[PDB]
Design a protein around this ligand. Structure first.
Ligand code: FAD
Ligand code: CL
Length: 486
């Protein structure tokens, strides 16, 4: 007979899940399995992203229960758990989505060795990305592109990505009854309290396939806004209705298929001929995700500076005092501090909002290593992607891809061009909710009578700026000019 296991790691979805379709095909019993390490916290990971994962698991549970099946959340390590449940369930086929991360390449190779000793067929289709990222490197001549423009000409030379896979059947083969490793009490979806978290999640984005599909349709409600999407022109101070899709947390965990997103964009572009072109287009943003995934998978030490053949070697400063002030939203700059507050509260910021805080920490003012700022973003970002966090932090640090260090964002005037009233700052920094808009970006420039009337006195209620931008910026630019002379 056929008893199949569909292993979920990314790909927390049912639409366009080619590995799920192979598992359910001709199967007598299907075992949807998610491997959960109960000692992860005893290793880093905030409760916002982790509950986003748990909420995303509850969506598959309701989806599997609606189709006559059931999601099995197994505890332990895949290498210890899979050899047991193989012979316990009589497994003949194991399917899971292909992953190109460094840890995943070591982990899947081990499970491939374990399934071969148990006589289990391993099937790993690609759907997390748009294309076969190995086929991109082969058709390019054996090397990955290092520019978006060279990368854009490659995927256009290949053609359209594969269409999204059809929906799975409405009735799935259930797991076999009376199995010890599939007990409901041991395979239930845990809560954030039970996994060992004290504080509740404060984010506003609910995880799951249902939420990803609903947010997708809401974005395509206005095809005019979809076709004319230009990324650098979006508003980073828009928090009530963000100026972008905010689909990154769902694309990270796999709740939303990238090929589903791409084929929906083509439906709009075919009717809107003056639509935006890459890289500023909405497709182009998906191509950024496809571009960084291709280079990082073929580049050694991509999440680090040393040993990285594409990262410029820069003698970043070790200043724990600036790092503590930047990660704790106490830099004295309300524009930077409000964004770092939105990071720990929502887990998501606008792309240009991440630009201001990343530039300020590195090549802009504090000259702290981009690696240290990436660790802070790995923990709180609900859309944390290993290849994407890394390449975008080397961009903002002028270490790779980007090399125009002379462009330094002003932590005072950047947010003023979009929000002169400071509506963004007053929401996340309520200590300045009464400060007049004339001094809300520069609280140290307000007279002491205005500071008391507004209820916010610099130094007692709000910290003074840790640096003078004109002095700090002038020092960081000169150092990067001497380093880029290497
Ligand atoms: C320092 C820094 C760190 C970042 N870390 C991450 C990260 O860990 N995870 C992450 O998903 N993105 C990361 N980004 C990219 C970008 O900031 C986010 O993808 C974007 O804010 C997500 O909003 P959205 O979903 O509304 O994007 P949209 O503009 O609506 O774009 C749609 C999708 O395209 C992709 N995309 C958009 N911009 C980029 C980009 N610059 N690079 C790669 N893919 C992109 C995402 O999957 C996104 O969901 C980072 C950028 C910076 C500057
Ligand atoms: Cl600016």
């Amino acid at each position: 007979v056929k008893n199949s296991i569909i292993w979920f790691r990314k790909g927390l979805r049912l639409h366009d899940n080619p590995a799920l379709l192979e598992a359910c095909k001709d199967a007598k019993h299907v075992y949807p399995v998610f491997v959960l390490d109960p000692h992860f916290l005893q290793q880093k990971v905030s409760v916002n992203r982790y509950n986003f994962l748990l909420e995303s698991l509850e969506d598959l549970q309701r989806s599997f229960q609606a189709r006559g099946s059931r999601l099995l959340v197994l505890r332990g390590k895949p290498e210890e758990v899979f050899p047991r449940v193989f012979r316990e369930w009589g497994v003949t086929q194991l399917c899971f989505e292909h992953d190109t991360e460094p840890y995943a390449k070591v982990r899947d190779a081990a499970v491939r060795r374990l399934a071969a000793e148990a006589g289990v067929e391993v099937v790993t289709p690609i759907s997390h990305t748009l294309y076969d990222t190995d086929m991109l490197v082969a058709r390019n001549g054996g090397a990955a592109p290092l520019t978006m423009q060279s990368f854009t000409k490659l995927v256009d030379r290949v053609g359209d990505p594969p269409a999204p896979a059809p929906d799975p059947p409405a009735a799935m083969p259930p797991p076999a009854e009376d199995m010890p490793s599939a007990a409901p009490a041991a395979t239930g979806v845990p809560t954030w309290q039970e996994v060992g978290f004290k504080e509740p999640p404060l984010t506003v984005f609910k995880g799951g396939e249902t939420e990803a599909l609903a947010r997708l349709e809401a974005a395509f409600q206005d095809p005019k806004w979809v076709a004319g999407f230009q990324k650098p022109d979006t508003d980073p101070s828009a928090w009530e209705k963000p100026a972008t899709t905010v689909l990154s947390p769902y694309l990270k965990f796999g709740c939303l298929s990238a090929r589903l997103f791409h084929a929906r964009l083509l439906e709009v572009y075919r009717r809107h001929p003056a639509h935006s072109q890459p890289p500023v287009s909405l497709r182009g943003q998906l191509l950024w995700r496809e571009f960084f995934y291709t280079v990082g998978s073929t580049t050694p030490n991509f999440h680090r500076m040393a040993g990285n053949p594409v990262c410029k070697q820069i003698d970043w400063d070790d200043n724990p005092e600036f790092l503590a002030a930047w990660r704790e939203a106490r830099t004295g700059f309300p524009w930077i501090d409000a964004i770092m507050t939105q990071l720990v509260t929502w887990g998501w910021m606008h792309h240009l909002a991440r630009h201001s805080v990343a530039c300020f920490l590195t090549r802009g003012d504090l000259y702290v290593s981009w690696e240290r700022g990436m660790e802070v973003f790995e923990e709180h970002l609900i859309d944390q992607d290993h290849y994407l966090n890394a390449a975008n932090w080397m961009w903002l640090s002028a270490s790779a891809f980007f090399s125009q260090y002379f462009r330094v964002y002003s932590p005072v005037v950047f947010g003023k061009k979009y929000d002169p009233e400071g509506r963004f700052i007053r929401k996340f920094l309520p200590v300045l909710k009464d400060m007049p808009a004339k001094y809300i970006y520069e609280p140290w420039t307000a007279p002491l009578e205005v500071q008391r009337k507004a209820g916010c006195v610099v130094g007692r209620d709000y910290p003074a700026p840790i640096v003078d931008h004109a002095v700090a910026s002038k020092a960081c630019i000169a150092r990067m000019a001497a380093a880029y002379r290497r």
